[PDB]
RNA sequence: AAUUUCUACUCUUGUAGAUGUGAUAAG
DNA sequence: ACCGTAAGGTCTTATCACTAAAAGATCGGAAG
DNA sequence: CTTCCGATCTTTTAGTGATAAGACCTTACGGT
């Protein structure tokens, strides 16, 4: 049967290792005399400076080719119209073929294969194009042949700088080369030319030529706009729109003298202004132009072709100089006063023509509106009422589709016009005050950052109030208007960079983190680790006494001439190096090695006789022809490769291929001179295999070997100080002098990859491509505790709770003799100072760093296959699998419950404290101080940076419960539900971020605590779940973690299901609510119990329900009589207490207050003076005087009685308590803290997650096939839970 | 308040947990 | 004959490298 | 003095099986 423990050894995890070098001996010395650093620090800043001109030199090779494409676009477009028309299957891919061919003759310009040039100058720009991406760039010659190039001396001596280094550039060069390609990709020339800019002078061209037909004596006039503007005077406008003249609008250059030509000088009239100016003079040709499309769509932009930008603020100098520079140039060209003119003419312009994002609506609404929700059910309603399909239509054109001024206006009301008047010109104030305060001369106190506050955030308000128009296209927006509205929002633009560059200032760290590649005059330092590479590579390992060295062996007067050390007896002192030998992944290797070789390809292209290649070989090889055309069939399936059976299903001719293939690897394995020591005879008879991927996943964990051996000590010591070998330690804090706790996973997995186990069996690979890097030491301002002075512990006696960071610094002055504090003065303990403790020590002086590469799970595949099925298959062979639901709470940061699978609860426990530390209290100590200082930039890092951190904590915690119950874990998806900022970790992206972080654990899961050799070991780590992608592609499973959507899981009865089913903002006017009584059955006072029973039936009030009917037809809720009860710890509470948020405004006011429902009934009962304690029915006496007061609290009490959740801060109190009650006839009330079930209240939410992993892990259980029902729906929860609860 | 780096600390010249880096596009 | 509901087809996912040996460029020295 | 050749440094080179699910649009059947 399967196991939990066969979770382990199924997919290779590549992780990197980083460690701090510290420089051992002489070799400091030699490299401040050599002075690499500072060459490298050149080379960095020289490989920055030189990125935008090798752009440059680009964009001049585009501009001089793109001036030769000459095509005709009829083919083409004709594709596009037939597509367009008719939609049929073939016409889409024979539009993706021709949209193909078009690419590919834009793409034979640059690369020269276009028949259409002649083969000298096609040859030419063959040339160009092949040395564009070489050392040849840099040596200076394709400049020479480039005609017409810019850089000057220094420019120059750029590019010779990185003569012979060309190796730094080569992701540069993988990014541009595809900017070039005939690919589809967006960032292409031939893409932006052919897909997206052609496409929209076709409809140009079009709508040109339907306007002529309609209105000839527009014609001249369009040509006098082209003589007035003074564009493409060689040619006609006739001419211009036309399929050929897009053999020029190719270049930038054109592309803005055709979009000028449209729009106008930004004066001069563009022909959009001319036809709106024709269609506001309202005549019959105003009105046909008016029936026709109207506008002229712009090209976009060529690529590579994009400015008030600076680099981020080094000192507040710097920032308040360059915020008073910006203000300065909006007062200058008085920004304000052309917004306020704006927001004037908005009333005069015709409102059909002005625009809103409809992404901004909602924003605007709670802008202009007293809810978020307003004005977009107010265009619903209207959507509809102007007229399930219908409302499906109407959604559609809410949710995508933006809505102009008129509609918006007419829709709303008179008084959306006021309140737009209102907020313009508020802000409009705050902004004037922005620009007539003056800049505090510096930031090192409170008001002076403030004050940089205020005016970045009213200058970024006013950003987004402009921001609130659309100017995206297909919408008829008037061209004067966006032509205005796109330069005053181009204006300021900067003011959002200004913020974030002096948000990102404000919550820097102190020191500096950048740091910059080292390469010791090596093209190639530390690219590999085999043996016959160490000479060019530099870089080698060596273990003595349990500690790590690296050593690099610098180019001796230009020369490597690398120095050889021989082994020695074991016995000896000194260090042992790694003896690495490898031979990379084979399909790759052997084709390269044996096949692809110069010599037989050439051979066979005139020969038929099988070549013997005998360099390299230990013996001569036979390469015969029938494998050549077996590895080269000039078609694109190999014949021993899958793609060949999937094309043809020859299953026994791929099994002959196949067999044929893998005998002669394994003939070249036995001969090649790397290889013919292994020893392949672990390796299947080759007939046996299934696939060629098999094969070689089964074959490349033989081809890496790791040995050790000895070398005495005074040869390496006498070649270190010499100056051949830099030697440096590899370092953290686990190989510290006083380490003695456990290490770091960091630690772990090097010192597993040196184990001896490991070396006879790889399971942590050592990869190549190491990097070393150099940290230079920061500013920093250096304090330190000195001796005789006080240290201050954050925590109290009780080391829960932490010192608030308000009061640590007066009480750490006070210590040292430099109210509250005062209270809690003999709650603190300091400590002597026994040894100094220098602040940021690690960034005080500069430093060697060194990022290498490892492999885990080495001998597994490449990539996980049906990873889900293997997981659902041990799931379903093992139905007692514990659930552990997770969620976070609003009294408590994360709580966890842990369930049987019979839905009993088996551990439920909140992560507040997390070793010994309470998280809960710290974040609201930051809390408070965040609302003490006025939301300052600082404390809101401060905040963010600590979620991160304990939610890193929270990793451990889950996965230690994880291995401890070998349990499914089911969290909240983030993709439908939504978060009051009342909870804790309330920021999507950081639960976000924490579920990646989790899934990257999990994959790779190594505990501390286990041998090396058990399963969670660092040589056998867990796998339980599947490699990330991507958060909306993940979907609801990804291994053992369930993704199940958060709504209805908090604010529900755990006894039975109950949820309150109505939806209050369809109750608050009078008629609703008298129907809303009328709708209940019945209420009557329960004699016996002092209980008040009603009575509501399902089917009744569906237009106050919301959309999801439960299982049950019928509820009883109960206002239970208020009493003492008695808990199990035996404290006294209010039985039936509600605790309801003060509303005014119809705002939350921050307050709350006790109500006692059936206290408050008898009082309104009493009051009113009907008869009742009788078990009469209630409502109709209470209803048939139709007092307004009476019904307006009576909705207020069913509203009091239906609130699940009740809590109060300032109190501490938070609970839950059904008004509902079961078939044992009993109320739930978390307040009796029974661990039978949800203990607090936010207990709850976690074991409702459990509850719909179970829901999932049932529903799979019951199938057949492995898979899960890829979503919850909510009727289908709110019918599961309290069906299963009866 | 010390770290390959981050977060929270201080019986311990350090503790507990986390940690896939680099390049390029981009948010 | 028109509309409502359910099933199928396809679009789309930030990627790459984690390398030793073959191939080519460079250059210093020897032969005629 | 040019040309050819050997050592050496640097740039380029081979490439295997594997998916997989959320979402939007289109199609076909059933109900009125």
Same mark, same amino acid.
Request: include cysteine; aromatic fraction near 12%.
């Given at each position: 049967?399967?196991?939990? /423990?066969?979770?382990?050894?199924?997919?290779?995890?590549?992780?990197?290792?980083?460690?701090?070098?510290?420089?051992?001996?002489?070799?400091?010395?030699?490299i401040?005399?050599?002075?690499?650093?500072?060459?490298?620090?050149?080379?960095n800043?020289?490989?920055?400076?030189?990125?935008?001109?090798?752009?440059?030199?680009?964009?001049?090779?585009?501009?001089?080719?793109?001036?030769?494409?000459?095509?005709?676009?009829?083919?083409?477009?004709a594709?596009?119209?037939?597509?367009?028309?008719?939609?049929?299957?073939?016409?889409?891919?024979?539009?993706?073929e021709?949209?193909?061919?078009?690419?590919?003759?834009?793409?034979?310009?640059?690369?020269?294969?276009?028949?259409?040039?002649?083969?000298?100058?096609?040859?030419?720009?063959?040339?160009?194009?092949?040395?564009?991406?070489?050392?040849?760039?840099?040596?200076?010659?394709?400049?020479?042949?480039?005609?017409?190039?810019?850089?000057?001396?220094?420019?120059?001596?750029?590019?010779?700088?990185?003569?012979?280094?060309?190796?730094?550039?080569?992701?540069?060069?993988?990014?541009?080369?595809?900017?070039?390609?005939?690919?589809?990709?967006?960032?292409?020339?031939?893409?932006?030319?052919?897909?997206?800019?052609?496409?929209?002078?076709?409809?140009?061209?079009?709508?040109?030529?339907?306007?002529?037909?309609?209105?000839?004596?527009?014609?001249?006039?369009?040509?006098?706009?082209?003589?007035?503007?003074?564009?493409?005077?060689?040619?006609?406008?006739?001419?211009?729109?036309?399929?050929?003249?897009?053999?020029?609008?190719l270049?930038?250059?054109?592309?803005?003298?055709?979009?000028?030509?449209?729009?106008?000088?930004?004066?001069?009239?563009?022909?959009?202004?001319?036809?709106?100016?024709?269609?506001?003079?309202?005549?019959?040709?105003?009105?046909?132009?008016?029936?026709?499309?109207?506008?002229?769509?712009?090209?976009?932009k060529?690529?590579?072709?994009?400015?008030?930008?600076?680099?981020?603020?080094?000192?507040?100098?710097?920032?308040?100089?360059?915020?008073?520079?910006?203000?300065?140039?909006?007062?200058?060209?008085?920004?304000?006063?052309?917004?306020?003119?704006?927001?004037?003419?908005?009333?005069?312009?015709?409102?059909?023509?002005?625009?809103?994002?409809?992404?901004?609506?909602?924003?605007i609404?709670?802008?202009?509106?007293?809810?978020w929700?307003?004005?977009?059910?107010?265009?619903?309603?209207?959507?509809?009422?102007?007229?399930?399909?219908?409302?499906?239509?109407?959604?559609?054109?809410?949710?995508?589709?933006?809505?102009?001024?008129?509609?918006?206006?007419?829709?709303?009301?008179?008084?959306?016009?006021?309140?737009?008047?209102?907020?313009?010109?508020?802000?409009?104030?705050?902004?004037?005050?922005?620009?007539?305060?003056?800049?505090?001369?510096?930031?090192?106190?409170? /008001?002076?950052?403030?004050?940089?506050?205020?005016?970045?955030?009213?200058?970024?308000?006013?950003?987004?109030?402009?921001?609130?128009?659309?100017?995206?296209?297909?919408?008829?927006?008037?061209?004067?208007?966006?032509?205005?509205?796109?330069?005053?929002?181009?204006?300021?633009?900067?003011?959002?960079?200004?913020?974030?560059?002096a948000?990102?200032?404000?919550?820097?760290?102190?020191?500096?983190?950048?740091?910059?590649?080292?390469?010791?005059?090596?093209?190639?330092?530390?690219?590999?680790?085999?043996?016959?590479?160490?000479?060019?590579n530099?870089?080698?390992?060596?273990?003595?006494?349990?500690?790590?060295?690296?050593?690099?062996?610098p180019?001796?007067?230009?020369?490597?001439?690398?120095?050889?050390?021989?082994?020695?007896?074991?016995?000896?002192?000194?260090?042992?190096?790694?003896?690495?030998?490898?031979?990379?992944?084979?399909?790759?290797?052997?084709?390269?090695?044996?096949?692809?070789?110069?010599?037989?390809?050439?051979?066979?292209?005139?020969?038929?006789?099988?070549?013997?290649?005998?360099?390299?070989?230990?013996?001569?090889?036979?390469?015969?022809?029938?494998?050549?055309?077996?590895?080269?069939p000039?078609?694109?399936?190999?014949?021993?490769?899958?793609?060949?059976?999937?094309?043809?299903?020859?299953?026994?001719?791929?099994?002959?291929?196949?067999?044929?293939?893998?005998?002669?690897?394994?003939?070249?394995?036995?001969?090649?001179?790397?290889?013919?020591?292994?020893?392949?005879?672990?390796?299947?008879?080759?007939?046996?295999?299934?696939?060629?991927?098999?094969?070689?996943?089964?074959?490349?964990?033989?081809?890496?070997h790791?040995?050790?051996?000895?070398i005495?000590?005074?040869?390496?010591?006498?070649?270190?100080?010499?100056?051949?070998?830099?030697?440096?330690?590899?370092?953290?804090?686990?190989?510290?002098?006083?380490?003695?706790?456990?290490?770091?996973?960091?630690?772990?997995?090097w010192?597993?990859?040196?184990?001896?186990?490991?070396?006879?069996?790889?399971s942590?690979?050592?990869?190549?491509?190491?990097?070393?890097?150099?940290?230079?030491?920061?500013?920093?301002?250096?304090?330190?505790?000195?001796?005789?002075?006080?240290?201050?512990n954050?925590?109290?006696?009780?080391?829960?709770?932490?010192?608030?960071?308000?009061?640590?610094?007066?009480?750490?002055?006070?210590?040292?003799?430099?109210?509250?504090?005062?209270?809690?003065?003999?709650?603190?303990?300091?400590?002597?100072?026994?040894?100094?403790?220098?602040?940021?020590r690690?960034?005080?002086?500069?430093?060697?760093?060194?990022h290498?590469?490892?492999?885990?799970?080495?001998?597994?595949?490449?990539?996980?296959?049906?990873?889900?099925?293997?997981?659902?298959?041990?799931?379903?062979?093992?139905?007692?699998?514990?659930?552990?639901?997770?969620?976070?709470?609003?009294?408590?940061?994360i709580?966890?419950?842990?369930?049987?699978s019979?839905?009993?609860?088996?551990?439920?426990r909140?992560?507040?404290?997390?070793?010994?530390?309470?998280?809960?209290?710290?974040?609201?100590?930051?809390?408070?101080?965040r609302?003490?200082?006025?939301?300052?930039?600082?404390?809101?890092?401060?905040?963010?940076?600590?979620?991160?951190?304990?939610?890193?904590?929270?990793?451990?915690?889950?996965?230690?419960?994880?291995?401890?119950?070998?349990?499914?874990?089911?969290?909240?998806?983030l993709?439908?539900?939504?978060?009051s900022?009342?909870?804790?970790?309330?920021?999507?992206?950081?639960?976000?971020?924490?579920?990646?972080?989790?899934?990257?654990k999990?994959?790779?899961?190594?505990?501390?605590?286990?041998?090396?050799?058990?399963?969670?070991?660092?040589?056998?780590?867990?796998?339980?779940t599947?490699?990330?992608?991507?958060?909306?592609?993940?979907?609801?499973?990804?291994?053992?973690?369930?993704?199940?959507?958060?709504?209805?899981?908090?604010k529900?009865?755990?006894?039975?299901?109950?949820?309150?089913?109505?939806?209050?903002?369809?109750?608050?006017?009078?008629?609703?609510?008298?129907?809303?009584?009328?709708?209940?059955?019945?209420?009557?006072?329960?004699?016996?119990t002092?209980?008040?029973?009603?009575?509501?039936?399902?089917?009744?009030?569906?237009?106050?329900?919301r959309?999801?009917?439960?299982?049950?037809?019928?509820?009883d809720?109960?206002?239970?009589?208020?009493?003492?009860?008695f808990?199990?710890?035996?404290?006294?509470?209010?039985?039936?207490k509600?605790?309801?948020?003060?509303?005014?405004?119809?705002?939350?006011?921050?307050?709350?207050?006790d109500?006692?429902?059936?206290?408050?009934?008898?009082?309104?009962?009493?009051?009113?003076?009907?008869?009742?304690?009788?078990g009469?029915?209630?409502?109709?006496?209470?209803?048939?005087?139709?007092?307004?007061?009476?019904?307006?609290?009576?909705?207020?009490?069913?509203?009091?009685?239906?609130?699940?959740?009740?809590?109060?801060?300032?109190?501490?109190?938070?609970?839950?308590?059904?008004?509902?009650?079961?078939?044992?006839?009993?109320?739930?009330?978390?307040?009796?803290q029974?661990?039978?079930?949800?203990?607090?209240?936010?207990?709850?939410?976690?074991?409702?997650?459990?509850?719909?992993?179970?829901?999932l892990?049932?529903?799979?259980?019951?199938?057949?096939?492995?898979?899960?029902?890829?979503?919850?729906?909510?009727?289908?929860?709110?019918?599961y839970?309290?069906?299963?609860?009866?």
């Amino acid at each position: 049967m399967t196991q939990f /423990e066969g979770f382990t050894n199924l997919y290779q995890v590549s992780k990197t290792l980083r460690f701090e070098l510290i420089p051992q001996g002489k070799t400091l010395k030699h490299i401040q005399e050599q002075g690499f650093i500072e060459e490298d620090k050149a080379r960095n800043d020289h490989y920055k400076e030189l990125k935008p001109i090798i752009d440059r030199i680009y964009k001049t090779y585009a501009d001089q080719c793109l001036q030769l494409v000459q095509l005709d676009w009829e083919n083409l477009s004709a594709a596009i119209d037939s597509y367009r028309k008719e939609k049929t299957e073939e016409t889409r891919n024979a539009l993706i073929e021709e949209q193909a061919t078009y690419r590919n003759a834009i793409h034979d310009y640059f690369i020269g294969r276009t028949d259409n040039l002649t083969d000298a100058i096609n040859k030419r720009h063959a040339e160009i194009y092949k040395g564009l991406f070489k050392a040849e760039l840099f040596n200076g010659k394709v400049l020479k042949q480039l005609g017409t190039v810019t850089t000057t001396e220094h420019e120059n001596a750029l590019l010779r700088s990185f003569d012979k280094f060309t190796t730094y550039f080569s992701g540069f060069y993988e990014n541009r080369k595809n900017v070039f390609s005939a690919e589809d990709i967006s960032t292409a020339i031939p893409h932006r030319i052919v897909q997206d800019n052609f496409p929209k002078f076709k409809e140009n061209c079009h709508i040109f030529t339907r306007l002529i037909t309609a209105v000839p004596s527009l014609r001249e006039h369009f040509e006098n706009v082209k003589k007035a503007i003074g564009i493409f005077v060689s040619t006609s406008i006739e001419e211009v729109f036309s399929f050929p003249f897009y053999n020029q609008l190719l270049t930038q250059t054109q592309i803005d003298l055709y979009n000028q030509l449209l729009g106008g000088i930004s004066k001069i009239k563009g022909l959009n202004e001319v036809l709106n100016l024709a269609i506001q003079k309202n005549d019959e040709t105003a009105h046909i132009i008016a029936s026709l499309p109207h506008r002229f769509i712009p090209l976009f932009k060529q690529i590579l072709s994009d400015s008030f930008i600076l680099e981020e603020f080094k000192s507040d100098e710097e920032v308040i100089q360059s915020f008073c520079k910006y203000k300065t140039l909006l007062r200058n060209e008085n920004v304000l006063e052309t917004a306020e003119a704006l927001f004037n003419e908005l009333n005069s312009i015709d409102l059909t023509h002005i625009f809103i994002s409809h992404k901004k609506l909602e924003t605007i609404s709670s802008a202009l509106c007293d809810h978020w929700d307003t004005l977009r059910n107010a265009l619903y309603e209207r959507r509809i009422s102007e007229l399930k399909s219908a409302k499906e239509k109407v959604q559609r054109s809410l949710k995508h589709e933006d809505i102009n001024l008129q509609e918006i206006i007419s829709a709303a009301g008179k008084e959306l016009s006021e309140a737009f008047k209102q907020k313009t010109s508020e802000i409009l104030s705050h902004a004037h005050a922005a620009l007539d305060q003056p800049l505090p001369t510096t930031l090192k106190k409170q /008001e002076e950052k403030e004050i940089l506050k205020s005016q970045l955030d009213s200058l970024l308000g006013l950003y987004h109030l402009l921001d609130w128009f659309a100017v995206d296209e297909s919408n008829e927006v008037d061209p004067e208007f966006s032509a205005r509205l796109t330069g005053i929002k181009l204006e300021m633009e900067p003011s959002l960079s200004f913020y974030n560059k002096a948000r990102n200032y404000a919550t820097k760290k102190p020191y500096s983190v950048e740091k910059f590649k080292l390469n010791f005059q090596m093209p190639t330092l530390a690219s590999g680790w085999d043996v016959n590479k160490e000479k060019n590579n530099g870089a080698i390992l060596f273990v003595k006494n349990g500690l790590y060295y690296l050593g690099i062996m610098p180019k001796q007067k230009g020369r490597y001439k690398a120095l050889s050390f021989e082994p020695t007896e074991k016995t000896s002192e000194g260090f042992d190096k790694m003896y690495y030998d490898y031979f990379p992944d084979a399909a790759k290797m052997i084709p390269k090695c044996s096949t692809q070789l110069k010599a037989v390809t050439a051979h066979f292209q005139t020969h038929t006789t099988p070549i013997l290649l005998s360099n390299n070989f230990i013996e001569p090889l036979e390469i015969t022809k029938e494998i050549y055309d077996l590895n080269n069939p000039e078609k694109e399936p190999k014949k021993f490769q899958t793609a060949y059976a999937k094309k043809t299903g020859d299953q026994k001719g791929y099994r002959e291929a196949l067999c044929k293939w893998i005998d002669f690897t394994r003939d070249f394995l036995s001969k090649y001179t790397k290889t013919t020591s292994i020893d392949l005879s672990s390796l299947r008879p080759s007939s046996q295999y299934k696939d060629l991927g098999e094969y070689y996943a089964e074959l490349n964990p033989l081809l890496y070997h790791i040995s050790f051996q000895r070398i005495a000590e005074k040869e390496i010591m006498d070649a270190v100080e010499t100056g051949k070998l830099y030697l440096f330690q590899i370092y953290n804090k686990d190989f510290a002098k006083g380490h003695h706790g456990k290490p770091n996973l960091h630690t772990l997995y090097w010192t597993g990859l040196f184990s001896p186990e490991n070396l006879a069996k790889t399971s942590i690979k050592l990869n190549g491509q190491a990097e070393l890097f150099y940290r230079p030491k920061s500013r920093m301002k250096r304090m330190a505790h000195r001796l005789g002075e006080k240290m201050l512990n954050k925590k109290l006696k009780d080391q829960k709770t932490p010192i608030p960071d308000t009061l640590y610094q007066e009480l750490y002055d006070y210590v040292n003799h430099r109210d509250e504090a005062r209270a809690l003065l003999p709650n603190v303990i300091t400590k002597e100072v026994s040894h100094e403790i220098i602040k940021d020590r690690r960034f005080t002086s500069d430093k060697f760093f060194f990022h290498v590469p490892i492999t885990l799970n080495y001998q597994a595949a490449n990539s996980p296959s049906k990873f889900n099925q293997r997981v659902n298959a041990y799931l379903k062979e093992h139905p007692e699998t514990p659930i552990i639901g997770i969620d976070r709470g609003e009294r408590n940061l994360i709580y966890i419950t842990v369930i049987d699978s019979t839905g009993k609860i088996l551990e439920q426990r909140s992560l507040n404290t997390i070793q010994q530390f309470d998280y809960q209290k710290k974040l609201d100590n930051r809390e408070k101080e965040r609302v003490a200082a006025r939301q300052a930039w600082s404390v809101v890092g401060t905040i963010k940076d600590l979620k991160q951190g304990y939610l890193s904590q929270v990793i451990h915690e889950i996965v230690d419960l994880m291995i401890h119950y070998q349990a499914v874990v089911v969290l909240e998806n983030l993709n439908f539900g939504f978060k009051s900022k009342r909870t804790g970790i309330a920021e999507k992206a950081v639960y976000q971020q924490f579920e990646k972080m989790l899934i990257d654990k999990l994959n790779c899961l190594v505990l501390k605590d286990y041998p090396a050799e058990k399963v969670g070991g660092v040589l056998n780590p867990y796998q339980l779940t599947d490699q990330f992608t991507s958060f909306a592609k993940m979907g609801t499973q990804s291994g053992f973690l369930f993704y199940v959507p958060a709504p209805y899981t908090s604010k529900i009865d755990p006894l039975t299901g109950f949820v309150d089913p109505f939806v209050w903002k369809t109750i608050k006017n009078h008629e609703s609510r008298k129907h809303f009584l009328e709708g209940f059955d019945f209420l009557h006072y329960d004699v016996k119990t002092g209980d008040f029973i009603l009575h509501f039936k399902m089917n009744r009030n569906l237009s106050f329900q919301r959309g999801l009917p439960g299982f049950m037809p019928a509820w009883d809720i109960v206002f239970e009589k208020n009493e003492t009860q008695f808990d199990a710890k035996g404290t006294p509470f209010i039985a039936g207490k509600r605790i309801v948020p003060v509303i005014e405004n119809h705002r939350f006011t921050g307050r709350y207050r006790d109500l006692y429902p059936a206290n408050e009934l008898i009082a309104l009962l009493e009051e009113k003076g009907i008869v009742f304690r009788d078990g009469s029915n209630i409502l109709p006496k209470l209803l048939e005087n139709d007092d307004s007061h009476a019904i307006d609290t009576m909705v207020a009490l069913i509203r009091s009685v239906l609130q699940m959740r009740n809590s109060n801060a300032a109190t501490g109190e938070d609970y839950i308590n059904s008004p509902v009650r079961d078939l044992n006839g009993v109320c739930f009330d978390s307040r009796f803290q029974n661990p039978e079930w949800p203990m607090d209240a936010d207990a709850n939410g976690a074991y409702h997650i459990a509850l719909k992993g179970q829901l999932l892990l049932n529903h799979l259980k019951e199938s057949k096939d492995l898979k899960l029902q890829n979503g919850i729906s909510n009727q289908d929860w709110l019918a599961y839970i309290q069906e299963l609860r009866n």
